[PDB]
């Protein structure tokens, strides 16, 4: 059975161009010590950036801009060495959120075209989620949607939790959700903004990137989806299908708590917001939500499976964000293996559930089957 | 026949309520002319709703109803009898003594803790308590308080929030407080209150009532605070420390794998010696120093909690009286957790008996026929 990675990223070289053109986060800079640039994407990296700008003895800010971000060859090598047959690549955070409304559409258009072209270089092994110019007007976002649905190898949309600027429960965003759903594009929801840095306290710099990445990201996703659900987006756009990064952040773990808090909320109940025919978060989880398996443990994975069903979980690696630190970056990646291992421990090696999670769900849901059969036969 | 114990259950004694009535800023209790019960306004997220109500006498009532259940011991015993609970380990609810001025704090904490002990004396064998600490006072006053509460009949631990002395639980100044409590063999019950900065919920947050702050803010705050403790080495520096985490650890069982992966892949941590081979993993800490309550409302979350800490380290709770039925006996907020246990481990199993009470009996030495706390 085929192995598909649905959570895996690239920054096209032209996108990288923009990042070193930038004076504020997100940005890429080169520092005296290493000829390997620094990728500075997150609010949490700001304090260390200012410290490294005013002090050469201070630690390097952000993360290393490796060749694994921009090189298609590196991507294919990674896939070969980790037993991945197919990747559905996507532009990584922060996408186009920082662009002015007038320029975003044209930049998104070019970058999406680049991804299509990259996928064409290895027919049958590469597909992509397109990024949208969500800092631009809604009409431009719709036009961009119509365009990407007709790009070769596009199998959905990646979007962040800020939406148009006011999150995913913004009613102005409803027509974007409708446009994407009607175009039968899967929506891959992905974190970036995390939580305000103050929540991590005054010693946060001592803990590296662990708190914003281990906690901020999945909590952001949970909050964004909970907001969507509460505003009734899933009911208003019944054909919408969303894939959630990091097994829904914390959603499978908190779904019961969310439900109990809703049914026990005085204000909601007494103002008619909790009717008897109400679709529960569990229903939405079985009907409109898919979860990636980037969860690193059979503990989280089993919760995700129990929440959405084994036919709705999809393997991913988050390549290239977690390289081995002291092991060979050209060898197998622990960050990939940990997830595959979680799958095996949870549902058993060789099982049909394993096959489903590791690739077959993605094949079915993203309609990769005809491409795959062709390739295996004709290629 | 086995004992059902509720370890997550609150009260505000009348004296404590009087203090809240007199306050001008949150936390406060405030009566409105159109309301039968006073309003309990505890959270940052309720601020905006409070101002709107202070001006416009037609805007919605702020905060939550301050029902009699908060102060009534008789209603506590009634809740227990009608929900099949033999034993409650009651605790002062958030925000405890966090808001008290430093000089007044130790005296008030001493009095309130003494009242809790006395309340437990009214129903011998059925009531124990977690004591709260005067954490706004200097650390030596806090230690003196710990030394007092250990001698109190029926006291079986300490409840505290995530702000510590004012800088969170990874604050090195807080370390001797953890040491003293652990040496006294008091279980620390970590509980949320501060939540998340309200901007994270967006401009439509008011429309969803309390759902986001309570369903997400609370457990997320718990996760962040404990993760900070772990990263700061608190669990290694205080090896005898035992902690009970509210709401099954918040999200920790679901995120433990992710935390470990982020650690081992952290370039800065690994390259500065902070990720040695002899590292005690979060998984190890979850099996050795962490207990989880079963206030999780689903067998899905409960199964993840059990897999993380073991069935011998999960404890039933209700969060009484914060989630009363709106329209209507036995509370759903209690029954949902019971049903989660039955569904996860099977009715009448020894796993069910453990989680429903026997773990708490063992860990908290819940035998009122003795004077001491049998470790
Ligand atoms: O997708 C990812 C993963 C880790 N860190 C990021 O900034 N983005
Ligand atoms: O313990 C609790 C539970 C719900 N809401 C609160 O403010 N405190
Ligand atoms: Zn990612
Ligand atoms: Zn062909
Ligand atoms: Zn509580």
Automatic annotation (TrEMBL), chain B:
- Annotated source species: Cordyceps militaris (strain CM01) (Caterpillar fungus)
List UniProt keywords, sorted A-Z: Decarboxylase, Lyase, Metal-binding, Zinc
Top-level taxonomic group: Eukaryota
* A GO-annotated cellular component: cytosol
Q: Which residues cross the membrane?
A: none
Name of the featured protein: Uracil-5-carboxylate decarboxylase
Asked if Secreted is a keyword of the record, the answer is no
Chain sites annotated for binding Zn(2+) = 8, 10, 191, 319
Specify the Amidohydrolase-related domain's residue ranges.
76-365
Alphabetical GO biological process terms: secondary metabolic process
Name the Gene Ontology molecular function terms of this record: carboxy-lyase activity; hydrolase activity; metal ion binding
Q: Please report which protein family the annotation says this sequence is part of.
A: Belongs to the metallo-dependent hydrolases superfamily.
Q: InterPro entries, alphabetically?
A: ACMSD, Amidohydro-rel, Metal_Hydrolase
């Amino acid at each position: 059975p085929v192995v598909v990675d649905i959570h895996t990223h690239m920054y096209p070289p032209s996108y990288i161009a923009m990042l070193e053109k930038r004076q504020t986060i997100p940005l890429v800079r080169t520092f005296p010590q290493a000829d390997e640039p620094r990728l500075i994407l997150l609010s949490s990296e700001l304090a260390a950036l200012d410290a490294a700008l005013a002090d050469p003895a201070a630690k390097l800010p952000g993360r290393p801009l490796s060749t694994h971000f921009a090189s298609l060859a590196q991507k294919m090598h990674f896939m070969d060495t980790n037993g991945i047959r197919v990747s559905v690549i996507s532009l990584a955070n922060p996408w186009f959120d920082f662009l002015a409304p007038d320029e975003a559409p044209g930049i998104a258009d070019a970058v999406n075209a680049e991804f299509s072209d990259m996928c064409a270089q290895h027919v049958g092994r590469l597909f992509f989620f397109a990024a949208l110019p969500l800092s631009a007007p809604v009409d431009a976002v719709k036009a961009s949607i119509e365009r990407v649905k007709n790009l070769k190898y596009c199998r959905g949309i990646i979007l962040g939790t800020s939406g148009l600027g006011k999150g995913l429960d913004d009613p102005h965003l409803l027509p974007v959700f409708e446009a994407v759903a009607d175009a039968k594009l899967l929506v891959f929801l992905h974190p970036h903004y995390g939580l305000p840095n103050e929540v991590y306290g005054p010693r946060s710099e001592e803990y590296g990137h662990v708190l914003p990445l281990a906690l901020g990201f999945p909590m952001e996703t949970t909050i964004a989806v909970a907001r969507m659900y509460m505003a009734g987006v899933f009911d208003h756009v019944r054909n919408l299908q969303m894939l959630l990064a990091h097994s829904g952040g914390t959603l499978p773990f908190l779904a019961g708590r969310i439900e109990s808090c809703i049914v026990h909320d005085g204000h909601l109940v007494k103002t008619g917001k909790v009717p008897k025919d109400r679709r529960t978060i569990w229903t939405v989880l079985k009907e409109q939500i898919y979860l990636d398996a980037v969860i690193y443990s059979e503990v989280g994975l089993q919760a995700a499976i129990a929440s959405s069903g084994a036919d709705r979980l999809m393997f991913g690696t988050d390549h290239p964000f977690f390289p081995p630190i002291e092991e060979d970056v050209q060898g197998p990646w622990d960050s990939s293996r940990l997830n595959a291992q979680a799958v095996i421990k949870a549902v058993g090696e060789g099982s049909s559930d394993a096959a489903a999670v590791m690739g077959l769900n993605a094949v079915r849901v993203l309609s990769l089957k005809a491409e795959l059969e062709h390739h295996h036969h004709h290629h």
